[PDB]
């Protein structure tokens with residue numbers, strides 16, 4: 001479906017903590033991290049990290065206020081990210097599933113942050129089996145083809 | 149050169165802090181993070197995170213003691229990682245370069261951790277221009293081909 005440089009980024013809450021989830025919209029691949037607080041600095045830093053790893057051209061969010069601080073706009077400026085406008089908003093979600101996966105592994109770990117990376121791993125390696133690729137395989141296929 | 153599932157993982161120090169650098173040996177692509185201390189818990193957690201994102205089968209290090217705690221061995225156990233034995237050790241380095249890149253951007257950021265992600269970004273997007281791919285492009289080409 002979508003252009004290969006579009007990501008969605010949102011926060012969810014669990015155990016009084018904050019989880020920042022990035023989804024590569026064309027593949028369903030996710031990167032996620034437990035942040036100590038839902039702040040502009042945390043998002044800017046996560047954006048730098050994400051952009052260093054994948055070719056990130058536009059990012060969408062379901063809370064536009066998330067991207068208004070100069071701190072975040074400076075990270076996008078530096079990394080060359082645009083904020084996406086082609087996905088409008090209805091008053092996905094691969095955020096519910098990652099909440100279901102976390103509950104399922106929650107007791108395998110003391111910290112939520114560990115349970116989260118467990119769930120990311122399971123999500124990205126899960127064979128979405130129809131011709132049955134995982135999201136980890138799909139992102140790589142999509143970005144590689146878009147190069148070659 | 150190398151199998152597409154081999155990574156090298158090491159720590160370096162800067163500004164009294166610790167930087168954990170993972171290199172995808174076949175492509176030169178790096179992921180790096182500033183950790184508060186050089187501990188088994190930090191490495192296990194980083195391993196979970198790395199394995200959720202790329203198909204990681206073996207990891208090498210230049211300090212074998214790094215991987216001896218049960219904490220780390222449990223992360224590899226869970227993620228299905230083997231510790232690599234096919235790269236022997238002479239009594240790379242893409243660790244020096246990332247130290248050169250950091251110095252070059254150091255004043256663009258208050259925190260070292262920010263400067264580090266800046267340097268990762270520059271390193272991975274740098275056109276190694278001979279037929280002139282970047283490490284970010286090469287990793288994706290290598291893993292995709294190894295699927296298809």
Ligand SMILES: Cc1nc2ccc(Br)cc2c(-c2ccc(Cl)cc2)c1[C@H](OC(C)(C)C)C(=O)O
Pocket residue numbers: 108109110111112114115188189190192193218219220222223226227
């Ligand atoms: C705090 C912790 N302590 C441990 C102590 C001994 C052992 Br054996 C494993 C862990 C693990 C542990 C748990 C699961 C896996 Cl797969 C690997 C290590 C954790 C996990 O935290 C990290 C990964 C940050 C170290 C956790 O959240 O429970």
Ligand SMILES: Cc1nc2ccc(Br)cc2c(-c2ccc(Cl)cc2)c1[C@H](OC(C)(C)C)C(=O)O
Pocket residue numbers: 040041042044045070071072074075078079256257258259260262263
């Ligand atoms: C602490 C900090 N405060 C800021 C305050 C205002 C503005 Br405008 C930018 C920053 C940036 C800043 C610097 C560079 C870029 Cl590219 C984006 C934001 C940082 C950087 O830290 C992060 C990314 C964690 C917020 C830094 O280390 O200096």
Ligand SMILES: [As]
Pocket residue numbers: 009010011020038043066
């Ligand atoms: As958020």
Ligand SMILES: [As]
Pocket residue numbers: 059067072073076081082083
């Ligand atoms: As932006």
Ligand SMILES: [As]
Pocket residue numbers: 157158159168186191214
């Ligand atoms: As280390």
Ligand SMILES: [As]
Pocket residue numbers: 207215220221224229230231
């Ligand atoms: As291991």
